Design a protein around this ligand. Structure first.
Ligand SMILES: [Zn+2]
Ligand SMILES: [Zn+2]
Lengths: 101, 209, 226, 50, 101, 113
């Protein structure tokens, strides 16, 4: 390419389809694009797993006692009722408040 | 520069009156919500070299349930107030029967005067505020829920109801703006009412520590 | 935030034995009239009329900041050139260059300190748009101007004329903690942590976000999960 | 779309491009080019779908 | 009164909410089980609707006990679901829309 | 600017005041050599850095095989059709999409924007 070429072809735009095949310059640019996603896949896990473990170790002992209150291992009260309502999260549904609007 | 300072002084007085009303002291409805014009006309529109000198704005208020416990507020003229400038207020405080007062400083207070406030606490429970800190009623913000100061009998009933000791409650430090705005010591439970998107309303309690 | 650097064009120092000599051809100085050393600075009208300043304000700011160690001779807005000269009334002359760097770095002409760039746009999502209730009990979505910033100085912004002190949020939890309190932090933290999850379009039950925000705040201070 | 990008470049070269408020000359040039190319891709995709 | 409370709880216009059991679907299920035929005048007495909704709201308890603190907590912990339940099991709505027997 | 070395010992002259006459003089730190000033100016600082790149453009760049060349813009000096054009490199440039033209023909060396 000419120096200082800002056109679509000179900066990565691929005007061909996967049925019509790619020109060599477009092929290399497409490789450059796919490399970025392939790198992020490996990099992301080392952060997500660390965040996962760190989150769990802080809350691992919080449970619902027989008062229906939510306490940690040292009986400090976190929530008076689980979720502000005392209901399990796997039996609820999306609904509409008819009287609001 | 006088209109800005007058506006700044009017807002400080308005927030102070709102604070006194929320804290339980008796304040007339006229003073609770007065426009800038009444303030401008009352005290004279001249913050620098004029009639509305920072001496001349002291609110002496009295509690609702008897007119004996009374609170002053003081707006010192010096930017950085010191011990010599707070002993005058201490002399005024012992001269009267009043037991607590507020100081709204223009700049930060010297550490020596802060120690003086601390070490006289049991006799006179007086605290400080910053002028910049008092230009907005932070209780009006949408993030801050409703705060209520529980009474000792109510706290005893609550602990007996849930059968939990004092230290098992969630706690709030005495230095955060809301607790400071209400002026509450440690070992004083605070009710917090907030709207809950799951249940409707939710009531929580915070023990000052 | 606006330092003098933003609205200035260039600077130059001269050694001008008489204030009335006017080595530079400036009739504004001739009508306006002790150190022979002086500084000159030219501004540009673009950035000055954009921020709507006056030379009198600049002179007042200089006189206030540097406490009558120095004086300003400013050209009127009438002439095409935005000129002003600086002297020193009674470690000789390099001090003048030092204070020029100081006044350039740090003279706060307009705005407040911690805030670099401020944007402006009309919102599109209903949750940023103002919502009212009409006389017929409707919920019409109003469209009003909002400003997103690039710094954070929540207190000096809230305590300003015509800013709406009820809805102004900052995405910094620490600043909210220092200004609004622990419970405001619990709400703001839930909002921010819900935004980063629902931005993808995914849905997470509110019970878990609430529980996480509770364990991080139930001690009266921000307990970071580390 | 390619012709539209070319004439945008021509405007930018002749200083005929006015920067978007809140944006710089490079940023707005980049934004305009991306806008044209994204619109072209969306239109071509819709045509293929139909 | 419930309408006013909902408007202050939800400044955002959307009524989409998450609640314990799908009332509209239960109404539809009842219609199909008992062959309602919403073409004839209904048999349900409008006062039975009110006196049954009140009794049901008593039945659903999250915070146990009878002291004023417990009753206030129970009222707060079920407020939204009660609003929805009353706003859908109306006397007008039941008589005109669902035609339940 | 006019930064001027000492004639005798070849060193930078420093500005100085002759207080008796209040006159700017350039004096060596090492010998007593002194000179009278001709610019009253000592320190000049272009903060906006509105730099004219045409000073730094070299005609030899016209020999670059990788640069684009056009005939639509003719030279204003010699009227030659062929001219090579390129953009600025520095971030400090006041115009981002500023195009600089160098005459392609040998020894015209005309450079414009
Ligand atoms: Zn020499
Ligand atoms: Zn030529």
């Amino acid at each position: 390419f000419i120096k200082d070429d800002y056109g679509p072809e000179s900066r990565g735009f691929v005007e061909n389809s996967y049925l019509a095949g790619l020109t060599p310059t477009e092929f290399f640019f497409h490789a450059m694009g796919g490399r970025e996603g392939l790198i992020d896949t490996a990099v992301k896990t080392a952060e997500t797993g660390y965040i996962q473990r760190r989150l769990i170790k802080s809350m691992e002992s919080v449970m619902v006692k027989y008062d229906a209150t939510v306490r940690n291992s040292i009986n400090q009260v976190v929530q008076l009722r689980y979720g502000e309502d005392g209901l399990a999260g796997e039996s609820v549904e999306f609904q509409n408040l008819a009287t609001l609007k | 520069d006088d209109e800005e300072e007058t506006y700044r002084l009017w807002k400080i007085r308005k927030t102070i009156m709102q604070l006194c009303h929320d804290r339980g002291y008796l304040v007339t409805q006229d003073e609770l919500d007065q426009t800038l014009e009444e303030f401008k006309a009352q005290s004279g529109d001249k913050p620098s070299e004029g009639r509305p000198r920072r001496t001349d704005l002291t609110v002496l208020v009295a509690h609702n349930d008897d007119p004996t416990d009374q609170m002053f507020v003081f707006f010192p003229e010096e930017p950085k107030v010191g011990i010599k400038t707070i002993k005058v207020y201490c002399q005024r405080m012992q001269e009267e029967n009043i037991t607590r007062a507020l100081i709204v400083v223009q700049q930060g207070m010297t550490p020596s005067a802060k120690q003086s406030l601390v070490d006289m606490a049991p006799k006179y429970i007086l605290e400080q505020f910053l002028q910049q800190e008092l230009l907005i009623n932070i209780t009006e913000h949408e993030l801050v829920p409703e705060h209520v100061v529980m009474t000792k009998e109510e706290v005893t009933e609550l602990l007996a109801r849930y059968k939990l000791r004092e230290n098992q409650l969630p706690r709030i430090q005495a230095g955060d703006p809301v607790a400071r705005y209400f002026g509450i010591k440690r070992g004083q439970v605070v009710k917090i009412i907030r709207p809950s998107e799951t249940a409707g309303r939710y009531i929580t309690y915070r023990l000052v520590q | 935030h606006t330092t003098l650097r933003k609205v200035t064009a260039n600077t130059a120092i001269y050694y001008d034995p008489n204030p009335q000599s006017t080595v530079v051809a400036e009739d504004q100085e001739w009508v306006n009239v002790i150190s022979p050393w002086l500084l000159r600075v030219e501004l540009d009208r673009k950035h000055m009329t954009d921020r709507k300043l006056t030379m009198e304000q600049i002179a007042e700011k200089i006189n206030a900041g540097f406490g009558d160690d120095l004086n300003c001779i400013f050209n009127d807005d009438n002439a095409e050139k935005l000129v002003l000269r600086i002297r020193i009334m009674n470690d000789d002359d390099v001090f003048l260059r030092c204070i020029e760097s100081n006044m350039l770095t740090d003279m706060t002409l307009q705005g407040i300190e911690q805030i670099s760039k401020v944007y402006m746009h009309l919102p599109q999502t209903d949750n940023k748009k103002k919502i009212i209730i009409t006389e017929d009990g409707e919920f019409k979505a109003l469209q009003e101007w909002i400003l997103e910033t690039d710094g954070v100085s929540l207190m000096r912004v809230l305590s300003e004329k015509d800013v709406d002190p009820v809805r102004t949020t900052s995405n910094d939890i620490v600043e909210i903690f220092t200004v609004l309190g622990i419970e405001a932090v619990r709400k703001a933290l839930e909002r921010e942590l819900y935004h980063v999850i629902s931005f993808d379009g995914s849905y997470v039950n509110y019970r878990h976000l609430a529980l996480l925000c509770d364990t991080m705040t139930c001690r009266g201070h921000l307990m970071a999960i580390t | 779309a390619k012709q539209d990008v070319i004439e945008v470049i021509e405007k930018a070269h002749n200083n005929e491009l006015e920067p978007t408020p809140g944006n710089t000359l490079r940023q707005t040039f980049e934004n305009q080019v991306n806008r044209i190319l994204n619109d072209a891709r969306d239109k071509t995709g819709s045509s293929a779908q139909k | 009164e419930d309408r006013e409370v909902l408007r202050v709880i939800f400044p955002t216009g959307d009524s989409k909410v998450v609640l314990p059991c799908n009332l509209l679907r239960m109404i539809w299920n009842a219609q199909k089980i008992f062959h309602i035929n919403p073409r004839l005048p209904s048999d349900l007495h409008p006062i039975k609707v009110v006196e049954g909704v009140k009794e049901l709201s008593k039945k659903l308890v999250i915070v146990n006990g009878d002291d004023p603190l417990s009753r206030q907590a129970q009222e707060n912990a079920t407020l939204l679901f009660n609003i929805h339940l009353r706003s859908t099991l109306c006397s007008r709505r039941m008589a005109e829309e669902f035609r339940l027997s | 600017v006019g930064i001027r070395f000492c004639q005798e010992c070849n060193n930078m002259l420093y500005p100085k005041e002759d207080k008796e006459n209040r006159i700017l003089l350039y004096a060596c730190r090492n010998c007593d050599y002194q000179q009278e000033a001709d610019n009253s100016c000592i320190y000049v600082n272009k903060i906006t850095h509105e730099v004219d790149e045409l000073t730094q453009i070299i005609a030899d760049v016209s020999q670059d095989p990788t640069l684009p060349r056009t005939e639509d813009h003719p030279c204003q000096k010699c009227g030659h059709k062929e001219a090579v054009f390129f953009q600025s490199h520095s971030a400090r440039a006041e115009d981002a999409m500023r195009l600089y033209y160098v005459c392609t023909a040998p020894h015209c060396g005309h450079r414009w924007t």
